[PDB]
Amino acid sequence: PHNYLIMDIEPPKSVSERDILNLLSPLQVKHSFRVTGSTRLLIVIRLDAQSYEKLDEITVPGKVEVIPAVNMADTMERCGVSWPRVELTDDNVTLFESESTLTDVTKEQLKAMLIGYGEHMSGLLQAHRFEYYQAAGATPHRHFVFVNSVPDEIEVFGREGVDIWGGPGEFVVKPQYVTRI
């Protein structure tokens, strides 16, 4: 099971996608995306020992958030849910950022809801190429979903298992069109 680092970057006006030279050259960059219509960037980095050591000579300018992450398929497999393990295609991609907003929830209740969401999505993930990244160690629960962009499928994918998490008022889902590199 791999460990990852998700960089959400809002660079200064002066810096123009030279962040790739800062990052891609010494690090193992798994994915590079730009939020369509903006200058915000989202970088998925695989944290091997070399990349982790090299990160301490790197400073990304701007408003940057760095989220340790895991492949949520690994978590589902550990919890007994089987998900397809298929690499994400170079086709156009939609990103869903999801966060739990419930204030009254137990650890066991949260695990039950997570397992239920995994079981519910298991059937509908067979016809798609996707990657789930859960923010490791972050509470409340938070994850990012990179899924192949199918027209007239954003509403279906976002509105799926929302009721398992507590309903439309207790689960924040933000779909975003992203452009590779």
Partner: protein, 180 residues
């Protein structure tokens, strides 16, 4: 099926027909228990058998189904363990207050509770019934378990939201009729 969990309270009446609950020719293929030292009686009976009784003080009559059926409907396997006996027989009534919860959320919580009880109650004779079409749902568990271990079931309340999301009643019962 058509199982009903019926609970009667005959504290007010000093004479009643609840001796029928010990009458094997009235109760067939059912279960009847009496709360120890109390005028409270309970039964799980098929609807035709329940139609034979016209007791006065009826606390409740909830259509229920055996957990095995519920777990099979969710493709979850729970062995039926052994049959309950009269030694250490305890009735646990669990009523979650699913405040601010959805139907899929309670379904996921019920599946998780089933998975947890699968290993927790694997070595004790029990009978678990779940209400049908009743909201908020009710769970009845005849557990025949060591009294010291009763407190170990406390953390299960966490599955539905914590100790005060769930009303929990514990009582000691005596078997009168147990027929299959």
């Amino acid at each position: 099926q058509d199982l009903v969990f019926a609970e009667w309270d005959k504290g007010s009446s000093h004479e009643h027909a609840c001796s029928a609950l010990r009458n094997s020719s009235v109760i067939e293929k059912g279960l009847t228990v009496k709360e120890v030292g109390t005028s409270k009686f309970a039964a799980v009976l098929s609807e035709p058998i329940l139609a034979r009784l016209k007791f006065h003080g009826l606390v409740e009559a909830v259509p229920v189904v055996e957990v095995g059926t519920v777990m099979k409907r969710l493709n979850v396997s729970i062995p039926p363990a052994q049959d309950i006996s009269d030694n250490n027989l305890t009735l646990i009534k669990m009523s979650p207050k699913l405040k601010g919860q959805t139907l899929q959320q309670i379904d996921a919580e019920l599946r998780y509770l089933g998975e947890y009880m699968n290993t927790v109650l694997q070595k004790c004779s029990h009978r678990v019934y779940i209400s049908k079409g009743t909201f908020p749902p009710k769970i009845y568990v005849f557990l025949n378990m060591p009294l010291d271990q009763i407190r170990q079931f406390y953390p299960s309340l966490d599955i539905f939201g914590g100790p005060s999301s769930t009303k929990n009643e514990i009582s000691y019962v005596q078997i009168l009729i147990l027929r299959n």
